[PDB]
């Protein structure tokens with residue numbers, strides 16, 4: 001019922017489990033958010049995404065501004081109504097994908113100018129335009145627009161990028177607050193930057209806290225630094241963020257990454273891996289990933305995973321899915337994606353339950369031992 005309320009029900013070390021209440025629904029944390037790129041979670045109906053256990057999905061802001069357009073979606077009734085998802089939706093600011101998928105990007109203090117990677121050039125993106133598009137889409141959790149620092153990054157380079165991003169965080173905050181309808185029904189998350197330097201991360205955390213946000217995301221990770229560095233950065237960075245607000249690790253999603261990130265205080269995750277790898281033929285299992293296309297699965301009657309309770313594993317065999325994927329059948333992508341998302345949601349439920357029971361450390365340990 002509230003606009004935003006985060007409650008921690010249990011803790012174990014730096015790990016915590018709880019819930020976030022929003023007008024459109026309750027989000028159980030730690031949470032994994034399936035990625036909906038072009039107003040759709042690849043190959044799945046919204047009801048199927050909900051069926052796997054998802055409480056919230058992530059909407060793509062760069063993609064949607066290009067096709068079908070933020071203004072058009074708003075006219076059509078908003079993203080929820082457009083795609084058929086009535087629960088909360090977190091929208092990325094668009095800044096990351098602009099710098100990764102756009103042609104001839106132009107950085108400035110005002111924002112970024114770019115060329116759409118597909119048809120001319122839906123062009124300008126600033127902190128206020130980003131917040132505006134996110135409002136138009138009707139997202140529940142709005143992300144402040146930032147400048148992600150590439151890996152590696154020199155201290156001065158990481159500093160100047162972080163400094164700009166903090167200036168953009170203030171502008172994002174003001175832009176969000178000027179829109180009453182948005183400020184009254186949505187939440188705004190700030191994004192910590194600073195690369196792998198803790199002094200920079202500390203400065204970013206303090207600026208962010210000074211402005212004030214509903215939740216804090218840890219940005220700049222999962223950009224090539226490797227799990228060891230990622231984890232090392234998480235170790236000192238997470239404690240810098242307000243304890244009473246959710247901590248969101250953007251773009252992190254390998255099963256092992258999530259488990260180690262939760263041990264470090266992270267409450268929210270998003271990644272294209274489950275959906276992406278599904279289309280590619282990689283299925284996640286408690287004993288590690290398997291590539292269903294491999295000949296050894298040609299006559300395997302067992303489900304993708306023997307403990308998984310998803311509809312796919314209850315009704316189809318590896319042999320059939322192996323056939324579908326090798327034949328390039330759409331049902332293959334549908335089945336594989338549904339299982340993978342189901343697998344991720346089950347992993348989050350096992351994480352939440354073990355934290356509430358005070359046995360997460362053992363779970364993590366047992367998980368890694370079997371998964372690898």
Ligand SMILES: [Zn+2]
Pocket residue numbers: 304305308309310311312313314339340342343
């Ligand atoms: Zn399954």
